[PDB]
Paper text:
In this study, we present a 2.7 Å cryo-EM structure of PrP fibrils present in preparations of infectious RML mouse-adapted scrapie prions, the most commonly studied laboratory prion strain, purified to extremely high specific infectivity. In vitreous ice, we found that infectious prion rods are predominantly single-protofilament helical amyloid fibrils. We determined a 2.7 Å structure of the single RML protofilament and de novo built and refined an atomic model in the cryo-EM density based on mouse PrP sequence (residues T94-Y225). The amyloid core has overall dimensions of approx. 10 × 7 nm and can be divided into a double-hairpin N-terminal lobe and a single-hairpin C-terminal disulphide-stapled lobe. Considering longitudinal stacking of PrP monomers, the N- and C-terminal lobes of the chain are staggered along the amyloid fibril axis, so that each N-terminal lobe is co-planar with the C-terminal lobe of the consecutive rung. Hydrophobic interactions between the N-terminal lobe’s V120 and the C-terminal lobe’s F174 and H176 mediate the contact between the staggered lobes. The other major inter-molecular interactions are the typical hydrogen bonds in the PIRIBS arrangement. Our model suggests that there are 15 inter-chain β-sheets in the RML fibril. The C-terminal lobe of the RML protofilament continues to bind along the opposing strand in the hairpin structure, resulting in the C-terminal lobe being a single hairpin, while in the 263K fibril the chain pivots at residue Y218 to swing in the opposite direction and fold back on itself, forming a double hairpin structure. Comparison of the cross sections of wild-type RML and aRML protofilaments show they are remarkably similar with the exception that residues 226–230 that are disordered in the wild-type RML fibril, presumably due to the presence of the GPI-anchor, are ordered in the aRML fibril.
Residue numbers in the entry:
A (entry chain B), B (entry chain A), C (entry chain C): 94 to 225
The structure:
């Protein structure tokens, strides 16, 4: 006789963001930036009744991977990448307070002429010759 | 006779961000940046009843990986990368307070002429020759 | 007779950020930056009942990894990388207070002419010749 009696009370099980290869917010590029043979995930959760006998499972597995970066004649002049050019600030600030003033003049002058030429300029070639 | 009796009360099980290869927010590049044969994760959780007998499982596993970086004729002139050009500040600041003033003049002057030529400039070649 | 009786009360089990290869926020590049044969993780948690007999499992494993960096004719002129050019500040600052003042003049002059030429400039070649 085999008797299995199961009564789990208010279980909570949460799986979030389970993947073989996870690249949710990845930024990839640049002549073969990311190479991956294979990726596998197998989370297992057991909290019931389990009874097994005389079985034969999951035998003789092979996972052969070859990941080759093997170009023959590769010429790259400019290869670049940047993530962020962030929080760049230029200001002229004045705060003036006069609780009480009788006979006065206030002058506030601000000039910005040629403050910057290049601020966030990543890749360029100027007056340059390349021969192949 | 076999008896399995299971009554787990209010269990909480949380799996989050389980992957074989995790590159969620990765930045990758640059002529074969990231090379991975294989990546595997098998997290296992057991808090029930488990009973097993006369079994034969998970035998004879092979995980052969070859990761070769073998380019033959590779010419790279400029290869670069930067994460962030962040929090760059230029300012001219004045705070002025007068609580009481009779017969006075105030003059605030601020100039910015040519403060910066290049602020965040990553890769460039100027008046340069390359021969191949 | 086999009796298994299981009554775990309010267990909490948390797995977060479990991976074979973890590169969540990595920055990678540069002509074969990161090379890895294989990476595996198998975390296991047991707090139930577990009864096993006469079994044969997980035998005869092989994990052969070859990770070869072997370019034949590699020419790299400029290879570079920077993380951050952060928190760069140039400022001219004045705080003035006069609680009480009768007969006075205040002048405040700020100039920035040519403060910086290159602030965060990583890679460049200027008036340079390369022969191959």
């Amino acid at each position: 006789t085999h008797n299995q009696w199961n009564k789990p009370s208010k279980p909570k099980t949460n799986l979030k963001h389970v993947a073989g290869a996870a690249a949710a917010g990845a930024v990839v590029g640049g002549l073969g930036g990311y190479m991956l043979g294979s990726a596998m995930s197998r989370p297992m959760i057991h909290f019931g009744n389990d009874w097994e006998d005389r079985y034969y499972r999951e035998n003789m597995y092979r996972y052969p991977n070859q990941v080759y970066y093997r170009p023959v004649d590769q010429y790259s002049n400019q290869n670049n990448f940047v993530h962020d050019c962030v929080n760049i600030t230029i200001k002229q600030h004045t705060v003036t307070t006069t609780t009480k003033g009788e006979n006065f003049t206030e002058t506030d002058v601000k000039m910005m002429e040629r403050v910057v030429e290049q601020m966030c300029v990543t890749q360029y070639q100027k007056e340059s010759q390349a021969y192949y």
